[PDB]
Amino acid sequence: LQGAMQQFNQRYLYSASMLAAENDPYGPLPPYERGFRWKLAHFRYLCQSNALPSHVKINVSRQTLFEDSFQQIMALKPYDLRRRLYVIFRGEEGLDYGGLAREWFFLLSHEVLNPMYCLFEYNYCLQINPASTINPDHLSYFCFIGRFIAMALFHGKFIDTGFSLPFYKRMLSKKLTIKDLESIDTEFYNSLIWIRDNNIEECGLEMYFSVDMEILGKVTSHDLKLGGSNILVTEENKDEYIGLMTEWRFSRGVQEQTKAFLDGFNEVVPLQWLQYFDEKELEVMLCGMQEVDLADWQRNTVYRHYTRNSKQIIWFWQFVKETDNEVRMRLLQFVTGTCRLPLGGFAELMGSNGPQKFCIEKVGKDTWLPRSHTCFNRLDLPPYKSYEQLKEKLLFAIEET
């Protein structure tokens, strides 16, 4: 876990500006844009204005960190988690000046992935496991992870493992789109788009407004509307079916765990305080910024119907070499779905289905906007006619929510 730590603290140094708070509420002095730095600054003023005096003790032994933290975080009243965090590592070194709590958040965000609690699949990716019910108390563990995550946001602390963009979208209660499903289940997504596009009453297919899932062998059949199991998907109603199926796929097998996480979060940091962030900003707020190395990225990128020498590839690397780091990370999220980089850099980039390098493919014509497939870390780049056209389209597309 040591290599992850060095990279962890280094993100704390790159990201210091993220701890700045607005001074007054009255605005800059005079000498649509997303306004991230200012939303972050106003969020910190909000938490800081809502901090409570004194502290809560958190007393952990390293060899037993998760269970001890679970016990002690769960027994504190939720709003007592807005006092100062004071963490002691039992019989070890000195006192918490803030530094041991940074350690604690780092170690906790990793210790939660330990297989013996069965909460998550399999790393820095948290995907809730449907079979988490194996653990009879998994609902109370998810509350704790909800409280633990809010505490980090409240206290301006980072964690080294995060959820996926569509998950943070439900956490900000944004309407999930079918393009989001592509990011979570491409086969399910292909079949939804197939149904939408082709005649079902001439394929002879027969589907019903009901869907089923299999968890540790036990199959359970959920109805998408009243009577849906007897209702036939026809040419007339297949748009509704696609809608309810998209919604249902985002939390399949994990509805209960997700409510236990959200409610635990909401008790510490009301979800409303986040309403103006988007899911990419929320993701960065939890794990920090890092500098994005352009050289490693460029030599581990792969092209479909483009080359090193296509003029749009040249323009793309010129766009990247000349934008700020905050823009490079946001393009990283557009294309890969995360701001995080694997330990081994871009040569080790991974897709949902095994290894997959950052990929740029030529599709369509000059009038199209850029599209992403985050599951295959593939950027669909139209053959634009000029650098300025490329810059403006790529900029509009990484910024679009």
Numbering used by the authors: 430 to 460, 543 to 633, 638 to 916
Q: Which sentences from the paper describe this structure?
A:
The Nedd4 family E3s have nine members in humans (WWP1/2, Nedd4/4 L, Smurf1/2, NEDL1/2, and Itch), which share a common N-terminal domain architecture comprised of a C2 domain and 2–4 WW domains that are responsible for subcellular localization and substrate recognition, respectively. Each HECT-type E3 contains a characteristic HECT domain at its C terminus, which catalyzes the transfer of ubiquitin from E2 to itself and then to the specific substrate. The HECT domain adopts a bilobal structure, in which the E2-binding N-lobe is connected by a flexible hinge loop to the catalytic C-lobe. To prevent excessive ubiquitination of targets and self-destruction by autoubiquitination, HECT-type E3s normally adopt an inactive state characterized by intra- or inter-molecular interaction.
To elucidate the molecular mechanism governing WWP1 autoinhibition, we determined the crystal structures of WWP1 in its fully inactive (2L34HECT) and partially active (L34HECT) states at resolutions of 2.3 Å and 2.5 Å, respectively. In contrast, the presence of the adjacent WW domain(s) together with L (e.g., 2LHECT or L34HECT) led to dramatic decreases in WWP1 autoubiquitination, suggesting that both WW2 and WW34 are responsible for ligase regulation. It seems that the WW3 and WW4 domains are packed closely together, WW4 binds to the same “Le” site on HECT, and L forms a kinked α-helix that resides at the same “H” site that spans from the “Re” site to the “Le” site. Importantly, although the 35 degree rotation of WW4 and 25 degree rotation of L appear to be significant, the crucial WW4-HECT and L-HECT contacts in the 2L34HECT structure are preserved in L34HECT. Our assumption is that the WW4-binding N-terminal extension of HECT is a flexible loop, which allows HECT-bound WW4 to rotate a certain extent upon crystal packing with a symmetric molecule in 2L34HECT; whereas the 25 degree rotation of the N-terminal part of L is the result of the missing WW2 domain and crystal contacts. We further validated the functional relevance of the WW4-HECT interaction in L34HECT. The point mutation at the WW4-HECT-binding surface (H517AWW4 or Y543AHECT) severely impaired the WW4-HECT interaction. Meanwhile, mutations at the WW4-HECT packing interface in WW4 (E503A, H517A, and H517Y) or HECT (Y543A, Y543E, W549A) led to significantly elevated autoubiquitination of WWP1 L34HECT, further demonstrating that the crystal packing-induced rotation of WW4 does not affect its inhibition in HECT activity.
